[PDB]
Write a protein that binds this ligand. Structure first.
Ligand SMILES: [Mg+2]
Ligand SMILES: [Mg+2]
Ligand SMILES: [Zn+2]
Lengths: 295, 119, 52, 168, 110, 77, 193, 86, 54
C-alpha cells in the first residue's frame, strides 16, 4: 500500500542534508590538540577553488548522518539448563568468542550461571565484553559519570550539546537504551532553550529533526529557521512533516488548498502547530522585512 | 628447541602477580615450560571475579577448532572450561564432583538437625 | 662451513649400541621376581600393591 | 648539508614513495641505458631517481645496470617461469617508465590492500603479552578487573599469607 | 620445478673460464647502506655449469638454478648468454651493434 | 627435577604407596561417563580434523582458488 | 593557617588579594627552581611539605596555602593545562612538586569527567558496519528437544544405578579396599538451615 | 650569535612579500584544521593564472640533523629533556 | 546431541546462509569404535627394559 519513508531514504537524506549545510569553518574548526608546523602552498585562483572544493567533499564525509535505530530487544535466551552444576560455583562464567574475522554483532557470548543454566549474554554485557577484548578509542568499559543527569545538565548549561552527542556515540551503540535516552534528553534541552543552531552544520542535525517530526514538535525548529531567513529549509520541514503524517490536519489542509512555499507554513500553523499565533507573527515579521528589501 | 617426541597442548599459562592469578590459554608444545614458548595464544581466563562478579573467559573458537584438528591435546582444566562454555560436554569429573558435593552437604544437614532437635 | 668432527661421539655411539645387543638382558633375568619381598632382583623395584 | 646532488634520494621517506611492487614472477631486472643522447634522457633520470625506489620495495629482485652497450635504452625483466619481458623506454619520461613497468609487472592496489589486511590479523587485540607484541600485558590493566597487587594491595582475605593464619 | 638452490634466476658477468664445463660468474646486487641510504654494488661469485663451454671472459650470462647442486660450489647452469663480449645483438632491433652505433642499419630490412 | 643418574633417596627406599579404596557404585558410574565423554570428544575431534583438511584443500585446489589462478594467468598474457 | 576558601576554592581567585599577588598571569610564572647546572633534574621534589613543615623553596601550589586543588576550581586548573594543545604540563615545566602535580592530574581528570573543564572530544566512526540483529548469536536460538522436556543434555549426566552383578564384580576385584557403596545423589543441592 | 640572530630575522620573507613577488595566493594547511585551505596572504596586484611548475623531485639542500631526527636514527639523552617554562 | 554452544553456532550458520530447517545436528559417533581399556595392545610397538643390572 503506502509505506512511510524511513530515515535512510534518499528523499529524507536529501532534505535533511540541505537543512544541515556545509560550513567549512565549523566542520574544520581548529581543534585543541597537539600542533605541528603548518605547511604553505602557492596556489592560483583556480587551484584555490579546487582546494575549497576538496574541503567541501571532505566535509560531506564528516557530515554523514548516523542511521537512526529503534531500541534493541533485550536478549533472554537459554541454550541449556544443567541442574547438575547447581551450587558448585558461586560466580558466573562469561565466555566470549574472540575470533577476529567475525562481526561484533555475530559473536557468541554466553554466560554460565551459578545455577548451572547456560544463557546468552545480555546487550549490556555484550557491549562491555567486546570493549575488553576489542578496545575502541573513546569507549570506556564502565559507563562514565558524564552521562548522569547532573553532569549532562552541566554540559547543557555550557552550550556543549555537540560534545554530549559525540561522547554518547563513542560509548554506546546506536540501538542501546542509554544511547536513546541521552540523545532524546539532549534534543529536549535544545527545543526548550532554542539551541537548534548548535547542531547546525553537524552530522547530528538530521537526528534532531527526525526526533522532532515524529513527536509533532517542529514548532520550535520552524520558528528558529524563519527568524534566521531559512524559508527554503523551513518549507522542507513542513513538507517532511506532511510526508511522514499523511493523515493529519496540516497534510489534508495542504492538499485541499494546494498550498506551496510560504503558504505551507500558514496551513500548518493554523491547523496543527501548537504555537500557531507565534508562528504567524514570526512569519508576518519576516514577510514584511523581505518586502522592503525587494523594493 | 626440538624436543624428543611430544605434541602440542592447549593449556593455561599462569600470569599476573602473587595472589593475583591469571591464565592465558595458549597452544604450546607439551615439553615446553608453563610460561615459556608457545605457538599461538588461544584466549585468556581470569579466575578472580571482577566488579560485576564475573569470571572473564576468552575462547578463540576458530583457532581452537584449528589446533584440535591439527592434533593438539587438551589439559584437564582446559577440558573443563570448554565444558562450562558448552563447547564440549561436561567433563565427568565436574559431574562427579557435583554429586560428591551434594552428598557432603546432605550429611551436614542431618548433623545440623540432630543438634537442634536433641539439644 | 667446516666444523671439527667428533669421531669419538660416533665411536662411542656404535660401541654402546653393539654392547646393548651382545650383553642384552634376557627375560629370565628381567622378569624374575622374589616371591617373598615381591621385588625384582634385576632392578630392585617393588611391584604394585594390587599385583601382589 | 647532506652530501651529493639531490640529497632527498637518500631518505627513507623518498624510498618508500615507490609505487612499483613487482609480482612474485619477476626475478631479475636489467637496465640498459645510454649516458648521452637526448632520447635516453628519461632512462638516465629513471636510473638516477626511480631505481632506488624500485629496489627498496623489491629487496629480493636483482637489479643490474649496464651503460652504453646498445644504441637505444631499454628494460628487460626475467620472470620466474623463464619468460623474458622486454620494455622499450626510448623517448619516454621516468614517470612514464615507472607507470609502464607497474602496469605490466606490478601488483595492483587491490592485491596490496589484501596483503596488509593479513598482517592485521597477526596482531590480535584480545591477546595478552609484552608491549612489543600485545597492547596489554595483564588482565589487571582492564578496568573493572582486580588491579595489580603492586599498585592496589589485595584484601587480606584474598592473600595466601593470611589464609593459612586464619585456618591455622 | 622445486630446487634447493636459493638463487633461482641470476644475471652476472663471467670472470673466468679456467674450469672444465664451468664458467665462474660474478653477480652484483644493489644493497642498501643502513646509514647512508645509498645502494652500492655487492659482488658474489657463482659457479655456472656450461656444457658447451661457449662462455667467454667478459660477457653477460643468465643462470638458472639446478634442482640439486651438481658440485660443492656449482649450483647453477648457463641458461642464455644475454650479451656476448664484443658481439652484442640489440634486442630492440635485432641488428648487431658496437656500443651506441649499429653495425648494420635497422633500415636494411625495413 | 631429578635426572635418571641421581641416586634414590634413602628415606623413600621403603616407601610404599597404598592404592585408594574404591567405591563400587561411584567407580562404575564414573567409568561409564569416561566411555561416553571420550566417545563424543573423539567424534568432535574427527570433525575438527576434517575442517582443517578441507580448508587446506580448498585453499590449494578449490573452485574459488583455481578461478583466481586462471584469472591472473589470463591477465598476465 | 586555616584558609577560609576551603569550602569554595573558586572564591579565592576572584578576590582582590589574588589580583594583587599574581595578576593576569599564571601562578607559576614567577617561580624558578634552584638546582645545579643548566639542565634541571627531570623530576621535581616529591613534596614541599613534610610533617606540617614547609621546605625553603615551596612550589607554586604549596607556597600559597589559599590555593586549593579541587575539581570545582576550574580556573586554577586551566593554568596548568596548555591552552593551545589541551595537555597537562609536566612537573618541571610549572615547577610544582610531584605530590601536587599528581593531585592536579587527578583534579583535572575529575573536572573533565564532570564536564566542568572544556576539552577536545574527537568524533569517531561507528563500531559495527552492519546493525542487523537477526543473527543467531543475538537472536533466540530454537530450544533443543532435551531442554524442552527437561532431560539432561546427555543421558549420562544423571545418575544411573549400576546393575547388582556389576557391583559384585567390583567388590571381588577390589577385595579389602572397598568403601561404603553410595546411592543416587540428592536431586538438588542442600542448604544449611 | 647576537649579530647573526638579528641578521637572519631581519632578512626573513613574510608571506605577504612572498605573495606579491610570486603573484599567487599563499594557502596555509593545518593538520588541526583538516583539509580546509586558509589564505594568509593575497597579492595586491594582478594575479597569475599559470600554476607553479610542480617539480617531481625538489633540488633543495637538506640538513642531515633534520633528516636523521625524522628517521629516528638520532639517539640523544640530552634531547627533548623536560625543562622550565620560557 | 551436539554440545550446547556448538549446536547453537551450527544452527546460527544455517540461518545466516538463508537455510531454513528444524533438524537438530548430531554427531556420527557410530564410526567411533570404543574399546575396553583391558584390550590387548601391540606388543610389537612396546619397548624393552634397559640392560643396567642391580
Ligand atoms: Mg580414550
Ligand atoms: Mg579418523
Ligand atoms: Zn609543592
Amino acid at each position: 500500500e503506502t509505506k512511510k519513508p524511513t530515515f535512510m531514504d534518499e528523499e529524507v537524506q536529501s532534505i535533511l542534508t540541505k537543512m544541515t549545510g556545509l560550513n567549512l569553518q565549523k566542520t574544520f574548526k581548529p581543534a585543541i590538540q597537539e600542533l605541528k608546523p603548518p605547511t604553505y602552498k602557492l596556489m592560483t585562483q583556480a587551484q584555490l577553488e579546487e582546494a575549497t572544493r576538496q574541503a567541501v567533499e571532505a566535509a560531506k564525509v564528516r557530515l554523514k548522518m548516523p542511521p537512526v535505530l529503534e531500541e534493541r530487544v533485550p536478549i533472554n535466551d537459554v541454550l541449556a539448563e544443567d541442574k547438575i552444576l547447581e551450587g558448585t560455583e558461586t560466580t558466573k562464567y562469561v565466555f566470549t568468542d574472540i575470533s577476529y574475522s567475525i562481526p561484533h554483532r555475530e559473536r557468541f557470548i554466553v554466560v554460565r550461571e551459578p545455577s548451572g543454566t547456560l544463557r546468552k549474554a545480555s546487550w549490556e554485557e555484550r557491549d562491555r565484553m567486546i570493549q575488553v577484548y576489542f578496545p575502541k578509542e573513546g569507549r570506556k568499559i564502565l559507563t562514565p559519570i558524564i552521562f548522569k543527569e547532573e553532569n549532562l545538565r552541566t554540559m547543557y548549561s555550557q552550550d556543549r550539546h555537540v560534545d554530549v552527542l559525540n561522547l554518547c556515540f563513542a560509548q554506546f551503540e546506536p540501538d542501546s537504551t542509554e544511547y536513546i535516552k541521552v540523545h532524546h534528553k539532549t534534543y529536549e534541552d535544545i527545543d526548550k532553550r532554542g539551541k537548534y543552531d548548535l547542531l547546525r552544520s553537524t552530522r547530528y542535525f538530521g537526528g534532531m529533526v527526525w526526533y522532532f517530526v515524529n513527536n509533532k514538535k517542529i514548532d520550535g525548529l520552524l520558528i528558529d529557521q524563519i527568524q534566521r531567513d531559512l524559508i527554503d529549509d523551513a518549507t522542507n520541514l513542513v513538507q517532511l512533516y506532511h510526508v511522514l503524517h499523511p493523515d493529519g490536519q496540516s497534510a489534508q489542509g495542504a492538499k485541499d488548498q494546494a498550498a506551496e512555499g510560504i503558504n505551507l507554513i500558514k496551513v500548518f500553523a493554523k491547523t496543527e502547530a501548537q504555537k500557531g499565533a507565534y508562528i504567524e507573527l514570526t512569519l508576518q515579521t519576516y514577510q514584511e522585512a523581505l518586502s522592503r528589501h525587494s523594493a | 628447541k626440538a624436543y624428543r617426541g611430544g605434541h602440542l597442548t592447549i593449556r593455561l599459562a599462569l600470569g599476573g602477580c602473587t595472589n593475583r592469578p591469571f591464565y592465558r590459554i595458549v597452544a604450546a608444545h607439551n615439553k615446553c615450560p608453563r610460561d615459556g614458548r608457545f605457538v599461538e595464544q588461544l584466549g585468556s581466563y581470569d579466575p578472580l571475579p571482577n566488579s560485576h562478579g564475573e569470571k572473564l573467559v576468552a575462547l578463540n573458537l576458530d583457532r581452537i577448532r584449528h589446533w584440535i584438528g591439527c592434533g593438539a591435546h587438551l589439559s584437564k582444566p582446559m577440558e573443563k572450561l570448554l565444558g562450562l562454555a558448552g563447547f564440549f560436554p561436561l567433563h565427568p569429573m565436574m559431574i562427579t564432583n557435583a554429586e560428591r558435593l551434594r552428598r557432603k552437604r546432605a550429611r551436614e544437614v542431618l548433623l545440623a538437625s540432630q543438634k537442634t532437635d536433641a539439644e | 662451513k667446516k666444523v671439527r668432527p667428533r669421531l669419538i661421539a660416533e665411536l662411542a655411539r656404535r660401541v654402546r649400541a653393539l654392547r646393548e645387543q651382545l650383553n642384552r638382558p634376557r627375560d629370565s633375568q628381567l622378569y624374575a621376581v622374589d616371591y617373598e619381598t615381591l621385588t625384582r632382583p634385576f632392578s630392585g623395584r617393588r611391584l604394585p600393591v594390587r599385583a601382589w | 648539508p647532506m652530501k651529493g646532488r639531490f640529497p632527498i634520494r637518500r631518505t627513507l621517506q623518498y624510498l618508500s614513495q615507490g609505487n612499483v611492487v613487482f609480482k612474485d614472477s619477476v626475478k631479475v631486472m636489467t637496465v640498459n641505458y645510454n649516458t648521452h643522447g637526448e632520447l635516453g634522457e628519461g632512462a638516465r633520470k629513471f636510473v638516477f631517481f626511480n631505481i632506488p625506489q624500485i629496489q627498496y620495495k623489491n629487496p629480493w629482485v636483482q637489479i643490474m645496470m649496464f651503460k652504453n652497450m646498445t644504441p637505444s635504452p631499454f628494460l628487460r625483466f626475467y620472470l620466474d617461469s623463464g619468460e623474458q619481458v622486454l620494455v622499450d623506454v626510448e623517448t619516454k619520461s621516468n614517470k612514464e617508465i615507472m607507470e609502464h613497468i607497474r602496469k605490466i609487472l606490478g601488483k595492483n592496489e587491490e592485491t596490496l590492500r589484501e596483503e596488509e589486511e593479513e598482517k592485521k590479523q597477526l596482531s590480535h587485540p584480545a591477546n595478552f603479552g609484552p608491549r612489543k607484541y600485545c597492547l596489554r600485558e595483564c588482565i589487571c590493566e582492564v578496568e573493572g578487573q582486580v588491579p595489580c597487587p603492586s599498585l592496589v594491595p589485595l584484601p587480606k582475605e584474598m592473600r595466601g599469607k593470611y589464609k593459612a593464619a586464619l585456618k591455622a | 620445478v622445486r630446487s634447493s638452490v636459493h638463487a633461482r634466476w641470476i644475471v652476472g658477468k663471467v670472470i673466468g673460464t679456467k674450469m672444465q664445463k664451468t664458467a665462474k660468474v660474478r653477480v652484483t646486487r644493489l644493497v642498501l647502506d643502513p646509514y647512508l641510504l645509498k645502494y652500492f654494488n655487492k659482488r658474489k661469485t657463482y659457479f655456472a655449469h656450461d656444457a658447451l663451454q661457449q662462455c667467454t671472459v667478459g660477457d653477460i650470462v643468465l643462470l638458472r638454478a639446478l634442482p640439486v647442486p651438481r658440485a660443492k660450489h656449482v649450483k647453477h647452469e648457463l641458461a642464455e648468454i644475454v650479451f656476448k663480449v664484443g658481439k652484442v645483438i640489440d634486442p630492440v632491433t635485432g641488428k648487431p651493434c658496437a656500443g651506441t652505433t649499429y653495425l648494420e642499419s635497422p633500415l636494411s630490412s625495413e | 627435577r631429578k635426572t635418571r643418574h641421581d641416586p634414590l633417596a634413602k628415606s623413600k627406599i621403603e616407601r610404599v604407596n597404598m592404592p585408594p579404596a574404591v567405591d563400587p557404585a561411584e567407580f562404575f558410574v564414573l567409568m561409564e561417563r569416561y566411555q561416553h565423554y571420550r566417545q563424543t570428544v573423539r567424534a568432535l575431534r574427527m570433525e575438527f580434523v576434517s575442517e582443517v583438511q578441507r580448508k587446506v584443500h580448498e585453499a590449494r585446489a578449490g573452485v574459488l582458488a583455481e578461478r583466481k589462478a586462471l584469472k591472473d594467468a589470463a591477465e598476465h598474457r | 593557617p586555616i584558609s577560609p576558601y576551603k569550602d569554595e576554592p573558586w572564591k579565592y581567585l576572584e578576590s582582590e588579594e589574588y589580583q594583587e599577588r599574581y595578576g593576569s598571569r599564571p601562578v607559576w610564572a614567577d617561580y624558578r627552581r634552584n638546582h645545579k647546572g643548566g639542565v634541571p633534574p627531570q623530576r621535581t621534589r616529591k613534596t614541599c611539605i613534610r610533617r606540617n613543615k614547609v621546605v625553603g623553596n615551596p612550589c607554586p601550589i604549596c607556597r600559597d596555602h589559599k590555593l586549593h586543588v579541587d575539581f570545582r576550581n576550574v580556573k586554577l586548573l586551566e593554568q596548568f593545562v596548555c591552552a593551545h594543545t589541551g595537555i597537562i604540563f609536566y612537573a618541571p615545566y610549572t615547577g610544582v612538586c610531584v605530590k601536587q602535580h599528581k593531585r592536579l592530574t587527578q583534579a583535572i581528570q575529575k573536572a573533565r569527567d564532570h564536564g566542568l573543564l572544556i576539552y577536545h572530544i574527537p568524533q569517531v566512526e561507528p563500531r559495527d558496519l552492519d546493525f542487523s540483529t537477526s543473527h543467531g548469536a543475538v537472536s533466540a536460538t530454537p530450544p533443543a528437544p532435551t531442554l524442552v522436556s527437561g532431560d539432561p543434555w546427555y543421558p549420562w549426566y544423571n545418575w544411573k544405578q549400576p546393575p547388582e552383578r556389576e557391583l559384585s564384580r567390583l567388590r571381588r576385584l577390589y577385595q579389602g579396599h572397598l568403601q561404603e557403596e553410595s546411592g543416587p545423589p540428592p536431586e538438588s543441592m542442600p542448604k544449611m538451615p | 650569535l647576537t649579530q647573526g640572530l638579528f641578521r637572519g630575522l631581519s632578512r626573513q620573507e613574510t608571506h605577504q612579500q612572498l605573495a606579491d613577488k610570486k603573484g599567487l595566493h599563499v594557502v596555509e594547511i593545518r593538520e588541526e584544521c583538516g583539509p580546509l585551505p586558509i589564505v594568509v596572504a593575497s597579492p595586491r596586484g594582478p594575479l597569475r593564472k599559470d600554476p607553479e611548475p610542480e617539480d617531481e623531485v625538489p633540488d633543495v639542500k637538506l640538513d642531515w640533523e633534520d633528516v636523521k631526527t625524522a628517521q629516528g636514527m638520532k639517539r640523544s639523552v640530552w634531547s627533548n629533556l623536560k625543562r622550565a617554562a620560557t | 546431541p551436539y554440545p550446547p554452544l556448538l549446536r547453537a553456532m551450527i544452527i546460527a550458520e544455517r540461518q545466516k546462509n538463508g537455510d531454513t530447517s528444524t533438524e537438530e545436528p548430531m554427531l556420527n559417533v557410530q564410526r567411533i569404535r570404543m574399546e575396553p581399556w583391558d584390550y590387548p595392545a601391540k606388543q610389537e610397538d612396546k619397548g624393552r627394559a634397559k640392560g643396567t643390572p642391580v
